[PDB]
Write a protein that binds this ligand. Structure first.
Ligand SMILES: Nc1nc2c(ncn2[C@@H]2O[C@H](COP(=O)(O)OP(=O)(O)O)[C@@H](O)[C@H]2O)c(=O)[nH]1
Ligand SMILES: Nc1nc2c(ncn2[C@@H]2O[C@H](COP(=O)(O)OP(=O)(O)O)[C@@H](O)[C@H]2O)c(=O)[nH]1
Lengths: 366, 366
């Protein structure tokens, strides 16, 4: 059977899609199922995963690189900065990962060039909207004007992976075989161009359907049987203390400080700037779930350990839970998560979580 | 029961999505079912429908205006030129149609302003790629840079319809009980930004999933029962002599001339320039159907009367059909349509077609 997982952010980004994406890749991989890891969009966000004691903040290479048997795809609907990809390939190779012979880079992706970074960095974008100024918008604007170059136009990408129009081969594997495709989305619903905060937003929308359009794969490409087995899943990742990037980046409900929360300060991957942080806003998450398509949503509550420090690093509830004060605290927070009947996981650290369902059992049962 | 129809082009545009869209609106309306007519994207193409002896080439107003009971939506994922919309409202009102009290214009749509038209018209776009230079790309570029204004920023739009964030009201109507939503796509698969002809292409992709993303409605928002009733349909419209816009607009297989084909020359709605015309290319249509998602595709063969002049204006096959030489010509052409088991209709004129299935019977039954 085939499956499509799309991992998306329910707030303004940095909800831990990297962690959840890798968890999904390893779900299929550890069960011996063929699996592919695809990244879409552009390098204006890093997705953090841990493996064997190392922390990887990836902007371009799919986080499925951690699993040796996973094919890695950079979708047609991407912007690819070759200096970023070169650095990430060099980085993982220096830790013994092998990626070049299983990395597929679509030739129709936009080539994000130095001039795109320069154009954003010298513009009013950061001052006006808090942009990372990493060139993604400038590249997309050039693509719209049909003056951008494509990945297929730069032979240097062939040193890093296979530059090939793989989309129909991939669709065929889903239709005609048994492939699990994990699509790593970026940022979060509330940053979407049309989600309500414009102009304090990013240059695309950030729903599952946007990332599927970028991937060039349709959920209805799956067979009736595979859809009936719940083969199409949208993983909406949320955190209890929503963040935004530093600066003039838009409204943040209940904005507070890392110190007031008793939490270590967090910094953005692509700029190292301190994140803004606020209190949980269920209305944003409600709108995100509705926009993504509630019938296929599974909700992942990341950083439950920031709400309940006693959970840090655990993969099961601690012994004295029923008798503790913080059992009610967690239950009360869960009560006000919209659509909480779809909650499937509690994140407890950068590489740990409490799984609410017997995912491996249900795989074996199909 | 609810339903979503998305009407798309299988080639380079002007396949007759206007005609097919109106046919879909009237299918629901003539059966007394609640129906909504939505347009997405921008006014770089006209969709031609006929009603009561008049020809309407619509760039902005949904063609469902022809049916008095149909709500009309301009989606969030749109570019709206107010001069175009004003002229089209004025035009239909002069023929007795009433639209202003049933027209809903999303405030998050981009406001396409005169400066966007001027920027394209004075640029190299038309010379380089055959662009209509109607400002859609320049407006999308400003939206990407977060410098565009929105429909919600111009009170003048409120003179023409209701400016309201209707998306969740619309989604609720679909989820909770019998609405048919007809989404009028534009252009055609082969013009897509990532479909393979870049830079001789338009500034977006043109698949069903792109138009659904613009609409803000997901096919999987439909209930299990409604999907099981085939509630989600992608109508891929093709013509036997594919066209392109005039000029340096890209490769056109088997390019010929209107005189060589024995057909009246056709002109584009938005520029009045003469269309280029070629011979049917099955590979393009195969790629279009695959990209749209074959499992939900119904194929409409428009302009069958250009292939078989004896069909012009007919709603049924002519009397002597079995004995004619035309039967073989039509049969052979259908044989080489990709996925021709999904053929549902033969267009025979600007407002006539031969339906291959008993659509009204199916509606009453299922
Ligand atoms: N304390 C805690 N940290 C997490 C958890 N999950 C992920 N992290 C981390 O918190 C962060 C989220 O940032 P980021 O990875 O950029 O999110 P992404 O962009 O959505 O993938 C990273 O530093 C992660 O390593 C969790 O469950 N608990
Ligand atoms: N001869 C013939 N013309 C059709 C048919 N269907 C539509 N037309 C017309 O052919 C054309 C297609 O152009 P257009 O409406 O712009 O296509 P659209 O952009 O896809 O909606 C228009 O002039 C239509 O009125 C058909 O079945 N036979």
């Amino acid at each position: 059977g085939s499956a499509i997982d799309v991992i998306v952010g329910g707030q303004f980004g940095s909800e831990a899609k990297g962690r959840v994406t890798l968890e999904r890749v390893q779900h299929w991989a550890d069960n011996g199922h063929a699996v592919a890891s695809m990244r879409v969009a552009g390098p204006n966000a890093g997705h953090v995963v841990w493996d064997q004691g190392h922390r990887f903040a990836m902007r371009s290479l799919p986080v499925g690189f951690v699993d040796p048997g996973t094919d890695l795809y950079i979708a047609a609907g991407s912007e690819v900065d070759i200096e970023v990809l070169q650095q990430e390939v060099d980085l993982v190779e220096s830790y013994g990962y092998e990626v070049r012979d299983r990395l597929y880079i679509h030739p129709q992706a936009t080539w994000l060039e130095p001039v795109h970074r320069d154009r954003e960095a010298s513009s009013t974008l950061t001052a006006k909207v808090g942009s990372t100024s990493k060139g993604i918008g400038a590249a997309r604007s050039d693509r719209i004007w049909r003056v951008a170059n494509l990945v297929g136009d730069n032979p240097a990408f062939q040193e890093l992976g296979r530059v090939s129009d793989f989309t129909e081969d991939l669709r065929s594997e889903l239709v005609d075989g048994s492939l699990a495709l994990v699509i790593e989305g970026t940022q979060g619903y509330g940053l979407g161009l049309h989600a309500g905060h414009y102009p304090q937003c990013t240059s695309s929308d950030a729903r599952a359907i946007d990332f599927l359009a970028m991937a060039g794969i349709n959920p209805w490409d799956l067979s009736r049987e595979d859809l009936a087995a719940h083969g199409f899943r949208i993983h909406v990742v949320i955190r209890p203390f929503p963040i935004r990037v530093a600066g003039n980046s838009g409204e943040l409900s209940g904005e507070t400080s890392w110190d007031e929360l008793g939490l270590e300060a967090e910094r953005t991957t692509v700029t190292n700037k301190i994140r803004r942080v606020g209190q949980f806003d269920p209305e944003l998450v409600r709108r995100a779930v509705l926009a993504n398509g509630v019938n296929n949503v599974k909700i992942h509550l990341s950083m439950a350990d920031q709400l309940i420090p006693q959970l840090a690093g655990l993969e099961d509830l601690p012994e004295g839970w029923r008798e503790s004060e913080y059992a009610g605290r967690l239950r009360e927070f869960i009560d006000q998560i919209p659509f909480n009947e779809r909650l499937v996981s509690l994140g407890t650290g950068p590489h740990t979580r409490i799984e609410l369902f017997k995912e491996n059992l249900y795989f074996q049962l199909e």
